[PDB]
């Protein structure tokens, strides 16, 4: 009922039936819904129970000519943050909000001229 699982951005420590479970890890820049490097993937009713097993983490960069209170802070997929630049510089396309996503920040945070 739950065929082989593939941990996008991770893998298994090492056909299946409901109730069985396998331990899995996340690659360097991802963590688990619990915030850990590892956890169980559980064969359930609606497939594997951690639907999305590994979730990306984003560190907010230092921004040349930016307000940089937030530089270094860590965010997790789905988390956003208010970006602002010094007068003369600006986030592109008049945007003000950047969002941590599977492949990283979107859009990328930078103060342009």
């Amino acid at each position: 009922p739950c065929d082989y699982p593939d941990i996008k951005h991770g893998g298994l420590y090492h056909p299946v039936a409901v109730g069985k479970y396998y331990s899995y890890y996340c690659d360097e820049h991802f963590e688990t819904p619990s915030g850990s490097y590892w956890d169980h993937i559980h064969c359930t009713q609606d497939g594997w129970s951690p639907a999305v097993p590994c979730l990306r983490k984003c560190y907010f960069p230092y921004l040349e000519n930016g307000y940089n209170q937030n530089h270094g802070r860590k965010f997790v997929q789905g988390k956003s943050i208010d970006v602002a630049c010094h007068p003369g510089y600006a986030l592109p396309k008049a945007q003000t909000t950047v969002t941590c996503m599977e492949n990283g920040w979107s859009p990328t945070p930078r103060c342009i001229r």
Partner: protein
């Protein structure tokens, strides 16, 4: 009367300069925008917390890609080479080598590249002010040399606060002067940059001298 003829040569050798360097801020902004990502990543991961060598390497890839950034620096020297030979030529050549010898995964190596870029950028701005300086220096109207000295001085202080904002302001302001356009003393950045107000004041004093010379030739 043979003084007028010389004041005109001055005014002319200045208008030529301003026209040739007209696009200076616009090309440095271009460079800045293409590089602000890389320099950001390098500063982020040269801070002692965590490191992404892939990122710190893509940073280096953006600088060296097609020897383009270096080339865009060479274009800006070409404009000011006439006025101030081998100001920048040394520091551009130096910067190109550092990027070649840039070693993969060495973060202290990257951060040297970032600091060198950030210096080379300021140097490019200073070379505009230096080129202005050598031209206004040769003016026989003394009141203009006095104003020009003060303008150079306040210009350089504005650069040390912020090089790209100082330059766009210096280029806009002198472009206004030689085009007989009124110079506004009111800040264009809501007084965020502390050096603007006094530079604009020097720019008004220089307008006055410039406007005094032009009336000699009527």
């Amino acid at each position: 009367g043979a003084m007028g003829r010389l004041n005109q040569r001055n005014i002319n050798e200045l208008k030529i300069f301003v026209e040739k360097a007209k696009y200076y801020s616009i090309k440095l902004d271009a460079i800045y925008n293409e590089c602000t990502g890389a320099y950001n990543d390098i500063m982020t991961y040269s801070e002692g917390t965590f490191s992404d060598q892939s990122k710190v390497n893509q940073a280096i890839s953006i600088f060296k890609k097609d020897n383009k950034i270096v080339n865009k620096f060479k274009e800006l020297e070409k404009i000011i080479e006439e006025y101030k030979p081998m100001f920048l030529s040394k520091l551009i050549d130096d910067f190109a080598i550092e990027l070649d010898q840039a070693v993969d995964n060495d973060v202290s190596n990257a951060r040297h590249v970032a600091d060198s870029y950030k210096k080379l950028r300021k140097s490019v701005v200073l070379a505009y002010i230096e080129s202005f300086d050598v031209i206004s220096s040769k003016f026989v109207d003394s009141k203009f040399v006095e104003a020009s000295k003060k303008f150079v001085n306040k210009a350089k202080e504005f650069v040390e606060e912020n090089d790209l904002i100082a330059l766009e302001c210096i280029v806009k302001t002198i472009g206004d002067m030689v085009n007989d356009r009124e110079i506004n003393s009111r800040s264009r950045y809501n007084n965020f940059y502390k050096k603007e107000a006094d530079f604009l004041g020097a720019a008004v004093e220089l307008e006055g001298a410039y406007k005094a010379i032009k009336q000699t030739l009527l």
